[PDB]
Scaffold this motif. Structure first.
Motif, PDB file in Angstrom:
ATOM      1  N   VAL A  12       8.683  15.574   9.634  1.00  0.00           N
ATOM      2  CA  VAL A  12       7.482  16.446   9.775  1.00  0.00           C
ATOM      3  C   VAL A  12       7.079  16.571  11.250  1.00  0.00           C
ATOM      4  O   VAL A  12       5.993  17.122  11.502  1.00  0.00           O
ATOM      5  N   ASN A  31       4.855   5.610  11.997  1.00  0.00           N
ATOM      6  CA  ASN A  31       5.648   6.574  11.187  1.00  0.00           C
ATOM      7  C   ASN A  31       6.703   7.266  12.059  1.00  0.00           C
ATOM      8  O   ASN A  31       7.204   8.316  11.630  1.00  0.00           O
ATOM      9  N   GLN A  48       5.186  21.383   5.975  1.00  0.00           N
ATOM     10  CA  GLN A  48       5.332  20.602   7.236  1.00  0.00           C
ATOM     11  C   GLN A  48       6.821  20.422   7.565  1.00  0.00           C
ATOM     12  O   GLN A  48       7.188  20.524   8.759  1.00  0.00           O
ATOM     13  N   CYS A  78       8.478  10.610   9.992  1.00  0.00           N
ATOM     14  CA  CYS A  78       8.774  10.767   8.546  1.00  0.00           C
ATOM     15  C   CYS A  78       7.473  10.625   7.745  1.00  0.00           C
ATOM     16  O   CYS A  78       6.674   9.712   8.049  1.00  0.00           O
ATOM     17  N   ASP A  79       7.266  11.522   6.781  1.00  0.00           N
ATOM     18  CA  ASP A  79       6.205  11.416   5.747  1.00  0.00           C
ATOM     19  C   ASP A  79       6.907  11.386   4.392  1.00  0.00           C
ATOM     20  O   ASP A  79       7.220  12.472   3.859  1.00  0.00           O
ATOM     21  N   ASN A 118       7.288  21.550   0.613  1.00  0.00           N
ATOM     22  CA  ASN A 118       6.561  20.901   1.737  1.00  0.00           C
ATOM     23  C   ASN A 118       6.641  21.822   2.957  1.00  0.00           C
ATOM     24  O   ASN A 118       7.759  22.051   3.454  1.00  0.00           O
ATOM     25  N   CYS A 123      15.200   9.601   7.458  1.00  0.00           N
ATOM     26  CA  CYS A 123      13.984   9.109   6.752  1.00  0.00           C
ATOM     27  C   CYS A 123      14.361   8.327   5.483  1.00  0.00           C
ATOM     28  O   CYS A 123      13.443   7.722   4.888  1.00  0.00           O
TER      29      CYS A 123
END
Length: 114
Positions: A107, A62, A5, A101-102, A3, A52
């Protein structure tokens, strides 16, 4: 599985070795990729990721606030219009941080509370 990001967030806002005195060098890097402010969280990646995955408190859109407070170093623009004439001051706080958080991945950094 990477990831990019989460990497970007880490490289910008996570450095366990960051100190008030190193604001000149640290900011000089970011001023290539003048910034008014940048906040560095003094912790291991896993500890910030835990915000997260159960160590956080939902705030909406988010955004998630850390249950425990962290130690942070803040580099603030004090002089100069444009590089290479820009000068920063380093300050140090110990407060809860708010992040985006994703999934289980931080992120973005949104600022400090408490």
């Amino acid at each position: 599985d990477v990831n990019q990001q989460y990497n970007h967030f880490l490289k910008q806002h996570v450095d366990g070795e960051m100190t008030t005195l190193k604001c000149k060098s640290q900011m000089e890097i970011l001023n290539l990729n003048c910034k008014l402010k940048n906040t560095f969280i003094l912790a291991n990646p896993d500890q910030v990721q835990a915000i997260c995955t159960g160590g956080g408190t939902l705030k909406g859109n988010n955004l998630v606030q850390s249950n425990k407070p962290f130690s942070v170093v803040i580099c603030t623009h004090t002089g100069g219009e444009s590089h290479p004439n820009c000068t920063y001051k380093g300050s140090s706080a110990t407060k809860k941080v708010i992040i985006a958080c994703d999934g289980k991945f931080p992120v973005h950094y949104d600022g400090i509370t408490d």
